[PDB]
Amino acid sequence: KVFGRCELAAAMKRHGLDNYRGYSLGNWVCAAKFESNFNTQATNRNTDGSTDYGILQINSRWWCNDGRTPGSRNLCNIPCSALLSSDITASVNCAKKIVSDGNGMNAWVAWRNRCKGTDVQAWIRGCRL
Ligand SMILES: OCc1ccccc1
Ligand SMILES: [Cl-]
Ligand SMILES: [Cl-]
Ligand SMILES: [Cl-]
Ligand SMILES: [Cl-]
Ligand SMILES: [Cl-]
C-alpha cells in the first residue's frame, strides 16, 4: 500500500507514534517518506547481506526474521514480511522498540541525514488530525 502523506500521519498518530519518546509526528512521516516513499511494500538489500523492509525500512540484521541474514537477531519477534502489510501495526510496534534502544531516531540514517533538525512539522501541515 502506498499511503498518502496525511493518511499515514493519521495512522501513525492512531498507533501512538505522535511524540513517542519525544519524537513529534512530523519526524515519523519525514522518516517514512525518505525510507520508503510511503510504500509499505518497499524492500532494499544492505551491503552486509541484510534487508530493510516496509514503511520504516526495518532491518533484518536485528529486528525481524527473513531466514536469509546469517548471525542476525529477530528482536521484534516477527517475520520480516509482516512489515510489508497494508496495516502498519507491526511496523509501528517494531519502530517503538527501535527508537527506545538508546540512539533514538538516529537508528534511521535517512532521518538523521534528511529530517533531523529540519522543519518536520511541514510533513503534517494541513492534515486533519
Ligand atoms: O533504514 C534504517 C533502519 C533499519 C532498521 C531499524 C531502524 C532503522
Ligand atoms: Cl509527500
Ligand atoms: Cl511535527
Ligand atoms: Cl543465523
Ligand atoms: Cl519468522
Ligand atoms: Cl494501518
Ligand SMILES: [Cl-]
Ligand atoms: Cl532521543
Ligand code: NA
Ligand atoms: Na536469518
